[PDB]
């Protein structure tokens, strides 16, 4: 089955990424912005530079240069799991327990987590 | 090259001058990968994967700036008193360059572009006698290698212009 | 008298295109319309110096000798963008 509402519609227009230079929120001003939908950009006011490691033997050689720990499974995020990704109110309230999946992305007054 | 882990590796080993030693090759030109990470899901935003060939270890020759004192002096209708605000400005710009305040090139806010200045050499020819103290090699970023009397003279002419920032070439 | 001189570009080398942009001083980003590109003759290209001088006096003018000294010193710049790398 398809849920009735696309997640983009459960996000408030004031929270979607900015679409003009007038609506730049604090992080868009501090870190900068580029419009993904047309013209518009702003160079960020915060610049990170001169990163240096102070320790010399900082990397963990596990014992030989050819060792390698196999690293669990980093699976892909799956927002179809509405009980994890969807919220009952645009304040980000988790969904109620016990309701069937048809409830997930249901009302327009639902929200994202 | 078309495969970052494939035929690109021979090409960079060639160009960096370590045709048999990639771990030295990638101390000169290093490919970087970046992702945009979607704010609700994590992972990566669909389509937003990109890579940079970062010249992490390319060494660069000294930058040459040529200041035409004759051309300024013509703009100021000869008055070498009027050079000091322009010379004062230039030395303030160079002070910031040496203090990492002027990054250069692409991606300055995105992990590139910050330079260390080791030495500024000032080498003028036929400078007017009151600017003759410029002929110097400086290694302190804060210009402290220029004579304090000269830096204090420039500061005075500069401050006198700040107090009235006229169009200095207006005769 | 100054003749036209053809430029011989180095072997395998070719005319380069330099990109240019104007960066808005307020936003710190490329200004609208201020994107341009310039063809440039690469460094190390050669051309003939093609001067003739018809002296009516004897000898050679000292200012014309100073000129040739200045060329050998590389104190002369030619063409566009002289303050911005070229010429």
Mutant choice from A33, A42, A44 vs C, greatest count of C C-beta within 10 A: A42
CB C39 within 8 A of CB C17: yes
- Choose the closest CB to B114 out of A43, A50, A77: A50
Give partners of C (≥3 CB pairs < 8 A).
Answer: A
Distance of CA B14 to the CA centre of its chain: 29
Q: Do B128 and B80 touch, CB atoms closer than 8 A? A: yes
- Please report where in the chains the tokens 């700040």 appear, as a residue: B162
Indicate the resolution in Å: 3.0
For residue C29, which residues of chain A lie inside 8 Å, CB to CB? 41-43
What phi, psi does A23 have (nearest 5°)? -100, 25
Angle at C62 between CA C60 and CA C65, to 5 degrees: 80
User: Distance (Å) from the C-alpha of residue C24 to the closest C-alpha of chain A?
Assistant: 10
The technique is: cryo-EM
- Whether the CB-CB separation of B103 and A47 falls below 8 Å is answered with yes
CB contact under 8 A, B109 and A32: yes
Residue B87 has a CB neighbour count (10 Å cut-off) of 20
* Chain B positions in Cβ-Cβ contact with residue A9 (cut-off 8 Å): none
Taking an 8 Å cut-off on Cβ atoms, the answer to whether A44 and B109 are in contact is yes
Taking CA–CA distances from A78, the nearest residue in chain B reads B41
Q: Name the region of B143 (left: φ>0; alpha: ψ -120 to 50; beta: rest).
A: left
- Closest residue by Cα to residue A1 from A112, A104, A113: A104
Q: Does C27 touch chain A (CB under 8 A)?
A: yes
Report residue A93 as tokens.
């309230």
Specify the pairing of strand A32-34 against strand A41-43.
antiparallel
Burial of B80 (0-12, 13-18, 19+ CB in 10 A): middle
- Distance from first CA to last CA of chain B, Å, rounded? 60
Nearest chain B residue to A33 by CA distance is B109
B29 annotated binding-site participant:
no
Shortest alpha-carbon distance between residue C30 and chain A (Å): 9
In chain A, which residues have their Cβ closer than 8 Å to the Cβ of B46?
none
10 Å Cβ neighbour count for B8?
Answer: 15
Give the integer Cα–Cα distance in Å for B25 and B21: 6
- Helices B83-98 and B148-162 cross at an angle (nearest 10°) of 110
Here the tokens at position B158 are 């500069």
Q: Residue A29 belongs to what H/E stretch? A: helix A26-31
| Residue where the block lists tokens 């005075």 | B156
What is the separation of C-alpha B96 from the centre of its chain, rounded to a whole number of angstroms?
Answer: 9
Q: Any chain A CB within 8 A of the CB of B23?
A: no
Q: Is A50 on the interface with B (CB under 8 A)?
A: yes
What the block records as the tokens of B102 is 């002027």
CB C44 within 8 A of CB C65: no
Are the C-beta atoms of residues A101 and A82 closer than 8 Å to each other? Answer: yes
> Which residues does chain A have within 8 Å of residue C32's beta carbon, measured at their own beta carbons?
39
Contacts of residue C30, Cβ cutoff 8 Å, sequence gap at least 6? A41, C21, C22, C23, C24
| Structure token pair of residue C79 | 């063409």
How many Å separate Cα C27 from the centre of its chain? 33
What CA dihedral angle connects C26, C30, C33 and C38, to 10 degrees?
130
Alpha carbons B90 and B124: distance in angstroms, whole number: 14
Q: Does residue B124 contact residue B135 with C-beta atoms inside 8 Å?
A: yes
Count how many Cα atoms sit within 13 Å of the Cα of residue A110 in the half-sphere of its side chain: 25
Token output for B126? 């036929």
Q: How far is CA A27 from CA B17, B90, B143, C28, in A?
A: 43, 34, 37, 16
Radius of gyration of chain B (CA): 24
Cβ within 8 Å of B, A 8-47: 32, 43-44, 46-47
What are the residues whose beta carbons fall under 8 Å from the beta carbon of B122, sequence distance 6 or more? B134, B135, B136, B137, B138
């Amino acid at each position: 089955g398809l849920y009735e509402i696309a997640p983009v519609d459960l996000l408030d227009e004031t929270l979607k990424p900015a679409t003009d230079k007038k609506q730049l929120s604090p992080a868009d001003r501090v870190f900068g912005w580029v419009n993904q939908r047309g013209n518009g950009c702003y160079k960020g006011q915060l610049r990170i530079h001169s990163v240096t490691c102070q320790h010399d033997d900082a990397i963990d050689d596990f014992g030989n240069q050819n060792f390698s720990v196999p690293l669990a499974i980093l699976g892909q995020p799956k927002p179809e799991q509405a009980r994890f990704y969807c919220a009952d109110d645009r304040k980000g309230i988790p969904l109620e327990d016990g309701y069937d999946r048809d409830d997930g992305y249901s009302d327009s007054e639902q929200g994202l987590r | 090259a078309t495969e970052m882990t494939g035929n690109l590796q021979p090409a960079l080993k060639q160009a960096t001058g370590y045709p048999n030693n990639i771990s030295q090759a990638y101390k000169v030109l290093q490919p970087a990968m970046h992702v945009a990470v979607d704010r609700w899901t994590g992972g990566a935003a669909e389509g937003m994967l990109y890579s940079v060939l970062e010249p992490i270890g390319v060494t660069w020759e000294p930058i040459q700036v040529h200041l035409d004192i004759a051309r300024l002096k013509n703009y100021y209708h000869g008055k070498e008193e009027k050079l000091k605000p322009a010379i004062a400005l230039l030395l303030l710009v160079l002070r910031d360059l040496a203090n990492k305040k002027i990054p250069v090139g692409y991606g300055t806010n995105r992990g590139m572009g910050t330079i260390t200045v080791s030495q500024i050499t000032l080498n003028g020819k036929a400078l007017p006698t009151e600017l003759e103290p410029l002929n110097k090699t400086m290694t302190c970023p804060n210009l402290t290698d220029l004579d304090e009397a000269f830096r204090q003279d420039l500061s005075t002419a500069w401050k006198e212009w700040i107090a009235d920032p006229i169009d200095l070439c207006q005769q | 008298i100054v003749d036209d001189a053809v430029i011989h570009i180095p072997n395998n080398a070719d005319v380069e295109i330099r990109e240019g942009v104007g960066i808005d001083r307020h936003f710190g980003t490329a200004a609208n319309g201020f994107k341009y590109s310039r063809a440039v003759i690469p460094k190390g290209s050669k051309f003939k110096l093609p001067l003739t001088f018809d002296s009516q006096d004897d000898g050679l003018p000292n200012a014309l000798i100073q000129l040739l000294c200045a060329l050998e010193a590389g104190d002369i710049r030619l063409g566009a963008a002289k303050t911005r790398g070229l010429g």
